[PDB]
């Protein structure tokens, strides 16, 4: 219960130590700025604690990473496994997909959940042992009681459900957030071993103050098109290099003046990577590596060639990058403004408009705050599930039956008690 | 108690003669009628729901208005505690059901991590997602949120 | 008080030309497009500085010969070994670069370390210049929108 | 203009059908009647 | 703005000396004429 209480504490004190771990990462950045090439070491100022607090703060930061992954296990991991168990249980309810459908080789996320139905302790952290025996009752009269039996299946060592835990952690590993923080802890491990890569913990600034994160979202949602466009660019560089391999085998000399043993980019690779490294990090042209206009009539077309590079490369490059990034920003600002539209024009349950509901002294506002009052439907559902069905009203038992039915017409189609008479 | 400026003094003395008469003058506030006053709070809650629904179904009645303002302090107390929605209760007409909201669920709803999951969910239901079964996805979020506040209070 | 200091020392006296910050309003709306978003701008430049920090640190462990500050190296050159010196070197060079660090890099001589070093310069070019222009004019034109 | 054209395609497939052309104001009175109105009442390939 | 309510000449350039003595009248029967005297000065 000491350790139970401490897990409770790390649950209820979780984001604060996360931001403190970020502050310790800033302190890591504070030190990694006085290294000297001799092996390496640290210089000295009036503060006299470089190496001891170095080692101590490294071990401390790694321990805080351990604390946050244990707390994150104590945090949302049951919520995510709750969502998973809910989805699997209701898909055996409304489909019986492991009875009947047998889904494809895509989503062995889903077929991963086959071998947990093997466990007798399958539907644990979803409170809903109803679902197991209801699905047991619902189909095996059609398809087999043997099929029902198949879909059945200090000192505490083997009296715990092993395969449930295996399935559980396999679902846990699918999280991007969990793998993110676990990989972060292993980075703290490698810095505990070798504190050269130790300052690479500064992807902690990828999941704090959200505006940078929305900028990263503007990066990542479009990035398939970005990467394929850079691949198209590489195709252009490839063929464009190949053009200056057939007709052009003298205009490059890598050494000084050519008498020193110069190199024309004849080799495919060498010429490939040469055009890549030169012309991408160019600053417009290949006016550096080109032979200047000396008067050759081949060199006329070679200057035209450099012009075609300039035009069909630099324009294209800027079109690749900031057109797509500002396009991402336009869609991000559009999405946020449409969120602010729909929270102020038509509610989820209202769905009419702010034309009707402002007739009286701020009735649209109170209509939002009271008549659809989004969290109070949540509280109502709590109030149902907390009560017993004998205790229900006919209204309460009615909505309960509609909820069990998963039929959803009991919710308003949009019109309200203000709409009927007023 | 009279320095709290609130009550009427004969009724303060009524509460005094009610109080405990516990053997010198001492009195525990919890053991007063308080512990039984929360079921009295439940009764007055139901009365408030009742008078509320009276006003809601049948408004504009000066008899009922006088009776309503007569019950002013109860509606002042219990509007933080009531629950109210609207549905179509199988009568093919727009209806409304008034009910209870406990407070500890609101204290774990006071947790703004739920509020930001909610606002991201707002973003989802507005744009990010196939508009397939809007309120059903909402209730999926609700069941998850129920489980979330179970986790939150259970710590 | 700026007029007072110019009355005392008329060197800073011409710094009164922030008077053009509160007249003809169109410039002021441009300054408004600057200032309302600027929290995101400053935090993004801080992110850029984090990238430069770690990216410098990468060329501190594996890369300790490809920079020589003097002429030809026989004159007493300096590899950017020091954390700070290498920090501010990458800042002042690569930010005011013009795309690449093709100046300070050793050219392709044929070393297989130098292959990855050229790939390193390419990663700088790509993950820096694109990001920079995305920082500045995407956000400024977003402000204008 | 490309993002405008794609978003207006996603508008008109979800607001006013080719044959409906009224809006999603009228047709959502019942349990998802606008959706079924699309899938059934104008059901584009079934005229074909 | 706490320590300007200490001043007797608090609500000067708002023409509205109403507000001082109305707030003086409105709450100190509940909470104290001495509280009214403190919010005077
Ligand atoms: Zn509604
Ligand atoms: Zn039609």
mmCIF file of N, CA, C and O and ligand atoms in Angstrom, chain D residues 17-22 27 37 41-42, ligand 2:
data_model
loop_
_atom_site.group_PDB
_atom_site.id
_atom_site.type_symbol
_atom_site.label_atom_id
_atom_site.label_comp_id
_atom_site.label_asym_id
_atom_site.label_seq_id
_atom_site.Cartn_x
_atom_site.Cartn_y
_atom_site.Cartn_z
ATOM 1 N N UNK D 17 -27.947 17.771 -52.962
ATOM 2 C CA UNK D 17 -27.627 16.799 -53.993
ATOM 3 C C UNK D 17 -27.960 17.362 -55.366
ATOM 4 O O UNK D 17 -28.537 18.446 -55.501
ATOM 5 N N UNK D 18 -27.543 16.615 -56.391
ATOM 6 C CA UNK D 18 -27.852 16.973 -57.772
ATOM 7 C C UNK D 18 -29.343 17.074 -57.992
ATOM 8 O O UNK D 18 -29.832 17.993 -58.655
ATOM 9 N N UNK D 19 -30.083 16.154 -57.407
ATOM 10 C CA UNK D 19 -31.484 16.021 -57.725
ATOM 11 C C UNK D 19 -32.251 16.619 -56.557
ATOM 12 O O UNK D 19 -33.364 17.126 -56.720
ATOM 13 N N UNK D 20 -31.642 16.606 -55.376
ATOM 14 C CA UNK D 20 -32.273 17.282 -54.255
ATOM 15 C C UNK D 20 -32.161 18.788 -54.389
ATOM 16 O O UNK D 20 -33.149 19.454 -54.685
ATOM 17 N N UNK D 21 -30.955 19.323 -54.251
ATOM 18 C CA UNK D 21 -30.759 20.753 -54.404
ATOM 19 C C UNK D 21 -31.507 21.657 -53.441
ATOM 20 O O UNK D 21 -31.743 22.823 -53.771
ATOM 21 N N UNK D 22 -31.906 21.163 -52.273
ATOM 22 C CA UNK D 22 -32.515 22.014 -51.246
ATOM 23 C C UNK D 22 -31.510 22.402 -50.174
ATOM 24 O O UNK D 22 -31.271 23.585 -49.935
ATOM 25 N N UNK D 27 -33.848 17.815 -44.392
ATOM 26 C CA UNK D 27 -33.925 16.377 -44.563
ATOM 27 C C UNK D 27 -33.385 15.589 -43.391
ATOM 28 O O UNK D 27 -33.332 14.365 -43.467
ATOM 29 N N UNK D 37 -31.714 9.875 -47.814
ATOM 30 C CA UNK D 37 -32.203 10.618 -48.963
ATOM 31 C C UNK D 37 -31.170 10.636 -50.068
ATOM 32 O O UNK D 37 -31.500 10.470 -51.246
ATOM 33 N N UNK D 41 -32.871 8.187 -52.358
ATOM 34 C CA UNK D 41 -33.817 8.983 -53.115
ATOM 35 C C UNK D 41 -33.203 9.599 -54.355
ATOM 36 O O UNK D 41 -33.942 10.001 -55.258
ATOM 37 N N UNK D 42 -31.884 9.711 -54.426
ATOM 38 C CA UNK D 42 -31.319 10.232 -55.659
ATOM 39 C C UNK D 42 -30.202 9.348 -56.169
ATOM 40 O O UNK D 42 -29.968 9.312 -57.381
HETATM 41 ZN ZN1 LIG F 2 -34.095 15.809 -55.157
#
